[PDB]
């Protein structure tokens, strides 16, 4: 809209380009008004789009970003965020970083108080993968994006890198599924997990069959006693019956408690799936080892 965006916003001076994602340009910028840092994601070119850029404007959590503005013309429109130093994705990729229990329980912890209040206040993710866990320059990780650009946005022509977003999708969506809650969240959460244990994506597949496949070779085909209506859904698909291979044998290292919270987060049934608040009470988080502090979190460097 012409009138519910401004077009122009002169405050802000680009520093030097930071990367090319699906649906926007990003870089960095200097706020002249406060001398702060900020990341500007440039979309190319709608009611529901600026109800979903004014609502997340208002919300406030240490561990969701902050989008601080928006300003665009005629074909673009441009979001502007808090700079975000690294993510989970680099952190996970880093051979040089080594991954302690008491590091992967804070990663965990905040991107879970993150989850709590979005879902608190009515609002799906939707798009949770490491590299929308950011993380500042003091250890604090920030739920970002929220597709915003792919709802509204024209593709990115220059993106070259490898679209990654079906690992992290649950089986209720595979199967098509067309109304669905906080499973959703909870499911990429679990993968999310899985990864910082394996450094590795847990289930990465290359079209939606080869991600059930995955999924049940992993985890086990599912019944319609463990998921009723399950053959129900849209997409739904027989596949060879899957055992699946026991969580301790995949998660070599992990304690009963951190298995049981694995567990809770994938389960097939997403009305049985854990909770971002059920998930926070679970003896992972009171059990020792304590997580990392912020300022002692290993940084890319
Ligand atoms: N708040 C931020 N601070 C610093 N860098 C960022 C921030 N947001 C995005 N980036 C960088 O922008 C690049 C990718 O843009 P990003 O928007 O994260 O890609 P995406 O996940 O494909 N989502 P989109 O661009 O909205 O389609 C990466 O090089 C990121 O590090
Ligand atoms: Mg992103």
Redesign the pocket.
Same mark, same amino acid.
């Given at each position: 809209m012409a009138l519910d965006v401004k077009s122009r916003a002169k405050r802000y001076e680009k520093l030097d380009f930071?990367?090319?994602?699906? *649906?926007?340009? %990003?870089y /960095?910028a200097r706020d002249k008004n406060t001398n702060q840092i %900020?990341?500007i994601?440039k979309?190319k070119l709608n009611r529901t789009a600026l109800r979903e850029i004014k609502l997340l404007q208002e919300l406030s959590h240490p561990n969701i970003?902050g989008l601080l503005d928006a300003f665009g013309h005629k074909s673009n429109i441009s979001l502007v *965020?808090?700079?975000?130093?690294? =993510?989970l994705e %680099?952190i996970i990729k880093d051979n040089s970083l080594v991954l302690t229990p008491s590091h992967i329980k804070a990663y965990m912890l905040m991107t879970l108080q993150g989850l709590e209040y979005l879902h608190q206040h009515w609002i799906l993710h939707r798009?949770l /993968?490491p590299?929308?866990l950011?993380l500042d320059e003091n250890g604090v990780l920030k739920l970002? =994006?929220f597709?915003?650009?792919?709802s509204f946005?024209d593709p990115?022509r220059a993106?070259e890198?490898q679209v990654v977003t079906r690992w992290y999708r649950a089986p209720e969506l595979l199967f098509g599924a067309r109304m669905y809650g906080v499973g959703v969240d909870m499911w990429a959460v679990g993968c999310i997990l899985a990864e910082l244990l394996l450094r590795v994506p847990f289930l990465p597949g290359d079209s939606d069959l080869d991600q059930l496949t995955r999924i049940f070779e992993t985890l086990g085909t599912p019944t319609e006693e463990q998921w009723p209506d399950m053959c129900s859904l849209p997409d739904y698909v027989t596949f060879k019956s899957f055992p699946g291979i026991p969580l301790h044998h995949i998660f070599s290292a992990a304690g009963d408690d951190l298995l049981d919270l694995i567990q809770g987060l994938f389960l097939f049934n997403p009305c049985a799936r854990i909770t971002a608040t059920q998930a926070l009470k679970m003896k992972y988080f009171s059990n020792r080892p304590g997580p990392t502090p912020g300022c002692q979190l290993p940084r890319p460097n």
């Open positions: 930071l990367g090319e994602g699906q *649906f926007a340009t %990003v /960095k %900020v990341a994601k979309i970003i *965020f808090d700079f975000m130093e690294t =993510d %680099v798009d /993968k590299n929308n950011l970002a =994006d597709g915003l650009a792919k946005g990115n993106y890198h």
